[PDB]
C-alpha cells in the first residue's frame, strides 16, 4: 500500500494585494496550488503560474466532488 500525494487545490475567499515583489495576489475566484508551506498562517502555492507566499487564513480548500 503506497501513495503518491503532491498538488493541492485552494480558492481565494479574500483578495490580498502583495506589497512586495515576492508575494502573491490573491483574487476572490483565484485558485492558488497549494505546493507547499511557508510558515504558520502562510503557505506557498502558484497563481496562474506564478509563485509566492500567502496567508492560508483568507482561502477555502477545496476536496471531494465540491464543484460550483
Not at 16 to 38: A, F, R
Not at 46 to 62: A, D, H, Q, Y
Amino acid at each position: 500500500g503506497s501513495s503518491g500525494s503532491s498538488g493541492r487545490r485552494c480558492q481565494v475567499a479574500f483578495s490580498y494585494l502583495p506589497q512586495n515583489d515576492d508575494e502573491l495576489e490573491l483574487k476572490v475566484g483565484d485558485i492558488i496550488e497549494v505546493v507547499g508551506e511557508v510558515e504558520e498562517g502562510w503557505w506557498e502555492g502558484v497563481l496562474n503560474g506564478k509563485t509566492g507566499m500567502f496567508p492560508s487564513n483568507f482561502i477555502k480548500e477545496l476536496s471531494g466532488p465540491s464543484s460550483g
